[PDB]
Structures are given as C-alpha cells and as structure tokens.
Design an enzyme around this catalytic site. Sequence first.
Site, PDB file in Angstrom:
ATOM      1  N   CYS A  93       4.073   1.675   9.368  1.00  0.00           N
ATOM      2  CA  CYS A  93       3.922   0.581   8.430  1.00  0.00           C
ATOM      3  C   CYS A  93       5.281   0.193   7.853  1.00  0.00           C
ATOM      4  O   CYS A  93       6.124   1.043   7.560  1.00  0.00           O
ATOM      5  CB  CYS A  93       2.917   0.898   7.332  1.00  0.00           C
ATOM      6  N   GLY A 113       2.869   6.066  10.051  1.00  0.00           N
ATOM      7  CA  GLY A 113       4.273   6.124   9.687  1.00  0.00           C
ATOM      8  C   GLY A 113       5.019   4.828  10.020  1.00  0.00           C
ATOM      9  O   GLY A 113       6.128   4.659   9.535  1.00  0.00           O
ATOM     10  N   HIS A 151       0.785  -1.238   0.000  1.00  0.00           N
ATOM     11  CA  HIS A 151       0.000   0.000   0.000  1.00  0.00           C
ATOM     12  C   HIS A 151       0.822   1.297   0.000  1.00  0.00           C
ATOM     13  O   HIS A 151       0.214   2.382  -0.033  1.00  0.00           O
ATOM     14  CB  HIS A 151      -1.070   0.009   1.091  1.00  0.00           C
TER      15      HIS A 151
HETATM   16  C1  LIG Z   1       0.398   2.431   7.666  1.00  0.00           C
HETATM   17  O1  LIG Z   1      -0.094   2.352   6.345  1.00  0.00           O
HETATM   18  C2  LIG Z   1       1.376   3.595   7.773  1.00  0.00           C
HETATM   19  O2  LIG Z   1       2.021   3.713   8.811  1.00  0.00           O
HETATM   20  N1  LIG Z   1       1.561   4.439   6.762  1.00  0.00           N
HETATM   21  C3  LIG Z   1       1.092   4.638   5.375  1.00  0.00           C
HETATM   22  C4  LIG Z   1       1.892   5.947   5.352  1.00  0.00           C
HETATM   23  C5  LIG Z   1       2.437   5.607   6.746  1.00  0.00           C
HETATM   24  C6  LIG Z   1      -0.777   2.586   8.652  1.00  0.00           C
HETATM   25  C7  LIG Z   1      -0.498   2.357  10.148  1.00  0.00           C
HETATM   26  C8  LIG Z   1      -1.711   2.630  11.052  1.00  0.00           C
HETATM   27  C9  LIG Z   1      -2.138   4.103  11.072  1.00  0.00           C
HETATM   28  C10 LIG Z   1      -3.046   4.424  12.245  1.00  0.00           C
HETATM   29  C11 LIG Z   1      -2.307   4.173  13.532  1.00  0.00           C
HETATM   30  N2  LIG Z   1      -1.579   2.905  13.486  1.00  0.00           N
HETATM   31  C12 LIG Z   1      -1.396   2.109  12.436  1.00  0.00           C
HETATM   32  O3  LIG Z   1      -0.864   0.998  12.574  1.00  0.00           O
HETATM   33  N3  LIG Z   1      -1.777   1.620   8.194  1.00  0.00           N
HETATM   34  C13 LIG Z   1      -2.966   1.999   7.691  1.00  0.00           C
HETATM   35  O4  LIG Z   1      -3.358   3.167   7.671  1.00  0.00           O
HETATM   36  C14 LIG Z   1      -3.852   0.896   7.147  1.00  0.00           C
HETATM   37  C15 LIG Z   1      -3.813   0.872   5.624  1.00  0.00           C
HETATM   38  C16 LIG Z   1      -5.199   1.269   5.124  1.00  0.00           C
HETATM   39  C17 LIG Z   1      -6.104   1.415   6.325  1.00  0.00           C
HETATM   40  N4  LIG Z   1      -5.248   1.129   7.497  1.00  0.00           N
HETATM   41  C18 LIG Z   1      -5.589   1.058   8.785  1.00  0.00           C
HETATM   42  O5  LIG Z   1      -4.810   0.666   9.667  1.00  0.00           O
HETATM   43  C19 LIG Z   1      -7.025   1.439   9.120  1.00  0.00           C
HETATM   44  N5  LIG Z   1      -7.701   0.257   9.647  1.00  0.00           N
HETATM   45  C20 LIG Z   1      -8.765  -0.238   9.036  1.00  0.00           C
HETATM   46  O6  LIG Z   1      -9.263   0.200   8.018  1.00  0.00           O
HETATM   47  C21 LIG Z   1      -9.404  -1.471   9.695  1.00  0.00           C
HETATM   48  F1  LIG Z   1     -10.520  -1.219  10.315  1.00  0.00           F
HETATM   49  F2  LIG Z   1      -9.601  -2.382   8.776  1.00  0.00           F
HETATM   50  F3  LIG Z   1      -8.685  -2.068  10.602  1.00  0.00           F
HETATM   51  C22 LIG Z   1      -7.192   2.685  10.025  1.00  0.00           C
HETATM   52  C23 LIG Z   1      -6.398   3.783   9.324  1.00  0.00           C
HETATM   53  C24 LIG Z   1      -8.679   3.057  10.112  1.00  0.00           C
HETATM   54  C25 LIG Z   1      -6.677   2.487  11.452  1.00  0.00           C
HETATM   55  C26 LIG Z   1      -4.655  -0.123   4.851  1.00  0.00           C
HETATM   56  C27 LIG Z   1      -5.284  -1.314   5.540  1.00  0.00           C
HETATM   57  C28 LIG Z   1      -4.174  -0.429   3.447  1.00  0.00           C
END
Ligand SMILES: *[C@](O)(C(=O)N1CCC1)[C@H](C[C@@H]1CCCNC1=O)NC(=O)[C@@H]1[C@@H]2[C@H](CN1C(=O)[C@@H](NC(=O)C(F)(F)F)C(C)(C)C)C2(C)C
EC number: 3.4.19.12
Lengths: 306, 306
Positions: B145, B143, B41
């Site tokens: 991930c 951040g 992603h």
């Molecule tokens: C991760 O992608 C990240 O760190 N990134 C992308 C740029 C930096 C991120 C980590 C998350 C963020 C929130 C706090 N802690 C985390 O572990 N993951 C992330 O945002 C993933 C990503 C899209 C949604 N997502 C989520 O974790 C969702 N969760 C859901 O949608 C769920 F209900 F299914 F669990 C939330 C952002 C709502 C928490 C995908 C799954 C591709």
Amino acid sequence: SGFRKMAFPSGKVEGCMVQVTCGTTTLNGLWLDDVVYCPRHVICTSEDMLNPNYEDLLIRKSNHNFLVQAGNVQLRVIGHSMQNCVLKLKVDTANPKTPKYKFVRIQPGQTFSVLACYNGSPSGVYQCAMRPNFTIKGSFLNGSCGSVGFNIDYDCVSFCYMHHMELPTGVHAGTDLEGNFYGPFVDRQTAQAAGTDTTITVNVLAWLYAAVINGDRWFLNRFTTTLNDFNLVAMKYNYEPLTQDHVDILGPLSAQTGIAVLDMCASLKELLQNGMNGRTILGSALLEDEFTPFDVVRQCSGVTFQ
Amino acid sequence: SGFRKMAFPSGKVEGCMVQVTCGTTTLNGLWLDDVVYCPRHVICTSEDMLNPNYEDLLIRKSNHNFLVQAGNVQLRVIGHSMQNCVLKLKVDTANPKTPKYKFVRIQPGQTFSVLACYNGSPSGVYQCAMRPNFTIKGSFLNGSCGSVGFNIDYDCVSFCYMHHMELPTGVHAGTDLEGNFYGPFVDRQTAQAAGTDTTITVNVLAWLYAAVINGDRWFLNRFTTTLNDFNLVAMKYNYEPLTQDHVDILGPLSAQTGIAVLDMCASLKELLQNGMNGRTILGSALLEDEFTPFDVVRQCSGVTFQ
Ligand SMILES: *[C@](O)(C(=O)N1CCC1)[C@H](C[C@@H]1CCCNC1=O)NC(=O)[C@@H]1[C@@H]2[C@H](CN1C(=O)[C@@H](NC(=O)C(F)(F)F)C(C)(C)C)C2(C)C
Ligand SMILES: *[C@](O)(C(=O)N1CCC1)[C@H](C[C@@H]1CCCNC1=O)NC(=O)[C@@H]1[C@@H]2[C@H](CN1C(=O)[C@@H](NC(=O)C(F)(F)F)C(C)(C)C)C2(C)C
C-alpha cells in the site's frame, strides 16, 4: 496476489548511462567509476560493419575522437583499450552516481532486466531470459546498442549483458561486460542465425508454483512421476532436461506449497501431452518459461533493494 | 525489432519513496517537496479496517505519531491533513530528489508503470492498464500500500495511481494522488467486487499495428468494414465501442503502416469471430489490450526521457 513480469527498479543503472559518438556512429555507454564501457563497433561506419578489423580501426583513433556526453556534460577521454567486443574509455571524471556493482556472466535460463536506451537516455525497462540458444527476446531499435542488462541484489548491481545486435526472427544477441558474446555470434554484419531454442523446464515449473500460490490450481493432477520418465516426455516437446540441481532449487516453492517437485512434474507432463483445452494459467494461454524460481520467490515474498 | 511490455525507467520515482508507520501499521509514502502522501488507512489497526471513521481516528493523532523514514533518516512531521482517501504529512525537509511532477487522474484504457514497494524500498516495476471497470491487474502483497503508478513525459513524472487494496479475483484498486478512488470502491474491509470488465478495443488495434510493424502480418485480410458494423460485432465479444476519437488517435500508426483503421477493424472482426487457430501474434495466443497507441509509437519509435 497477482503475478506480473516485473523488472528491477532501474534508477541505479539510469545514473550510469552516457552517449558515445565516434565519427557518425552514436550509441550508449556505461559509465562506472572513471571508465566508460561500450560496444567496440562504435568505431565503425556502416560500411566497416560487413567485416571490420577492429584492432586496425582502433589503431587509427585518438582519445579526442570519442565524444562522451553525460546529459549536458562532455567527459574528456584520457585513455582507451579494447577487451574482446567491448571498448573501455578511460575518462577524467569518476561517475559520482556509480553504485556498488559487479560484472557477471549469467547462465542460460537466468533472467535479468534490460534498460533500453537511445542517445544515452533511458526509454524503458523490461525483464528478459538468456535463452538456451544464447539469445534474448528483447525490444531494440537502431540506437539501442550499448544498453545493458542487470540484476539487483540488495544494494549491488550485477551487470550481465550489453546489447550489440539483432538476428533473424527479431531476437537479440550481445556480450557480458568483459565483451565476450553469449552464444556463437560475432560482431559483424553477415548471415548469422540463432540455434533452435528449447523451453526452460525449471522455469515453467517455477511458474506453475506461482499459479498455485495465486490460487490457480486446475492443472494439478493426483499423480506423480519419476525424474527419468518426466525427462523422456520433456525431450519430445523440446524441453530442456530437469536435473537434480533444478529439483533442489525448486525446494523452497515445493515446501511453501506442499507440492513435491515430482508431483508438479506429473502435472506438467499432462499439460504437455493434452494441451490447456482453451484454459489459462495466470492469464496466459501458453506455458511461461521466463520466470526463474528466484523470480517467483522474490515476487511472491516481496524482496526489495536498497 | 521486438515488442515487449515495457515500464518507464523508475529512478525519478525511487528517489521519492519513504516508509510511513503509525502505531503498528507500516506502508509506503511518496515524498515530494516537503509533503509525504500515503493512504489514510495507515492510521488504522487491522480491527479499525472493517469500518473506520477516518476523521475521528485522525482527530486523535499528533504529528509525532507518524514515523517517516527515508532510508536511514527520520523526517520529522510538522503537520498533517486528510484529502479524500489520502493523508498528507507535512515534513521539515524538502526532498532534494523531487523531480518535475504533476498529479493526473488518468482515463480508463490508459497505461502506466507501477513501482511496487515494501517498507519504502522498491521491489520492481511493471506496466498496467486502468481497466474499463476501474481496476488494475497488478502484483501486490501486504506491505505494498502506498506504491504509486506514473507516466514519464520527458523530464516530468505524472503520478496517477496510489495503491490501496485488493479485490476478489486478485485485481487491485486505488486512488489518484488527490485521494479519489478509481471506480466505486471504498477504503473499508467489506465485500466489494469489480464490475464485469470489457476489452479495450483501441488498444487491441494499436497492438495489431505493432505486430504489422514487427512483420507479423498473417491476420491481415483483404476486406474493410464500417465503424457501425464493426461496433456491433465488438459489442458481442465484450469489446468497448470504438469512437471516431479512437480512430483519429490511431492515425499515426495507420499512416506509418499504410493500413486504414477500418481495414484493421475488418481484420480484428475476423479474429473475434474465427479465433486464432492456434497461431500467435507477437508471441501471444490471446489478443492484448494493455498497449495504448502512444505505447506502441513510443516503443516502435524509441522515445526517451530526460
Ligand atoms: C495495504 O493496506 C497494505 O499493504 N498495508 C497496510 C499495512 C501494509 C493492503 C494491500 C493488500 C493486502 C493483501 C494483498 N494485496 C493488497 O494489495 N490493503 C488492504 O489490506 C486493504 C485495506 C483494508 C482491506 N484491504 C484489502 O485489500 C482487502 N480487500 C477488501 O476488503 C475488498 F474486498 F474490499 F476488496 C483484503 C485485505 C481482503 C484483500 C482497506 C481497504 C482499508
Ligand atoms: C547497434 O549497433 C546500434 O544500435 N547502433 C549502432 C549505431 C546505433 C545495432 C542495433 C540493431 C539495429 C537494428 C534493430 N535492432 C538492433 O538491435 N546493431 C547492429 O546494427 C549490429 C552491428 C552490425 C550488424 N548488426 C545487426 O544487428 C545486424 N544483424 C546481423 O548482421 C545478423 F544477421 F548477424 F544478425 C542487422 C543490422 C542486419 C540487424 C554489428 C553486428 C557489428
């Protein structure tokens, strides 16, 4: 989200660990530049440890009597001196993996990571607090002496602890890197006990802010208190006094959450007086006091190291 | 003595962390030999994440679209492919700090260390368990991930987890290094919930052995039980079934302490039925299930890594 007892990444310290043997005593040393730092009781046999005269024992050692091994490599000792409870072995090779570093003497209440080592090799890493009674609640077996504790700021390792001994209750005592003990302990095998400990109030408040940030808000009440009448209650439950400096240090968490420190003090008072009624805060059934305000900010803001 | 949740030393993994940016999305990558591994992603904008077609998004990327930074140094991408939920970026430089390594898919109940990272830089390290419901209870901000989880055996890093997402309740989900999720989760922003979790029985028993080794013996009763009648009681309190394999794995701790596994099962039954009456075991007011038998042995025997 989520909140975990989190250690500093250990790699910069791993590169400084060596094994020091003198006679039949082996423990861990810290290799920085061309000096190896270790507990002075490396020069004792078991026997010697009931009441050593370290100055006398050291008079009778040559450089060659110290075997210093960095993995496969023996480092030749070219000099030695004692500073307080620490031995400094000058070696013929500067450690190429020496990070930017400082020696700091931390204050009671502050936290640090311990890199537990045996035979100069790391076993694992975990976060401690320097307790008000100048002990830490560690995990240390025979062979762990010379393991160090540290904080990382950016690129810089601040070493604050070197491990020397275990007290009754299975708590631990040691020195700063200048070889001065934390607390009233001495490096001798005789009856010593930790003072009665107290709960680090400012750290409990920091952890309640962490709970709020993580969405665990049940214990928040609608009241406030004065610093004076909070501190009377704290005294009863063996909590350390909260000072205005502590209030100011909690300022960033208070601002971020919108909860005044004295309002959080009201909430804590009620938890102390009423218990938690089988409820948990951040997974825990007890109040946690080994997170500093800085630890909470670091963890909830994502502070990293170079 | 003493017993702490202890992480593996992180240095070997620290040397493999990089930053990966695609468009305006930045997350962490794992650099081993001449491959960088990251969550697929990275190729999404926020918008894309409600329901991405990853195969389609990737068709439209060139090598140059991926900016890979290892500290100061950009690594030029010379190839890319997707494996399950993981992107593999072939780069023009082999990582000189690549340790001996394996990719392992761990079993529910097993533990590992997480090196939490932001912008390719480590923030801290902590130990997790893969829960029966295929989540971990971590500490992860936006951040994080691409942060990985691992075990160390001697010189060899076994990578088992790459972080992708956060579920309701503030628990975490991710993949092995072949990009297959643990549990039924998908890498899309839609309503997903963890299954109801269970308590890892074999790990609670391992932790009760740790308590005994540390001298905390109050909960030991004078009785025994059968495996069958223990497992009926466990079922009620949402504890996973104890199998004969589990009994055999607990053999080393049982031998060391002289306490038969079924006698410890009797003691646990009473704790489950009667509670702890305000008492603690190893500092804790709840029963701990994120120590494996191996974790206890490692910690109480001083196992180290090369
Ligand atoms: C991760 O992608 C990240 O760190 N990134 C992308 C740029 C930096 C991120 C980590 C998350 C963020 C929130 C706090 N802690 C985390 O572990 N993951 C992330 O945002 C993933 C990503 C899209 C949604 N997502 C989520 O974790 C969702 N969760 C859901 O949608 C769920 F209900 F299914 F669990 C939330 C952002 C709502 C928490 C995908 C799954 C591709
Ligand atoms: C440490 O010296 C070590 O690891 N060595 C030397 C070769 C490897 C050792 C660490 C201890 C050992 C027991 C389990 N955990 C530990 O942290 N320290 C050590 O043995 C020190 C050392 C002499 C006594 N000592 C102790 O820790 C004593 N404690 C006391 O005597 C006390 F009551 F004062 F606390 C015990 C061995 C009884 C635990 C000296 C203080 C020089």
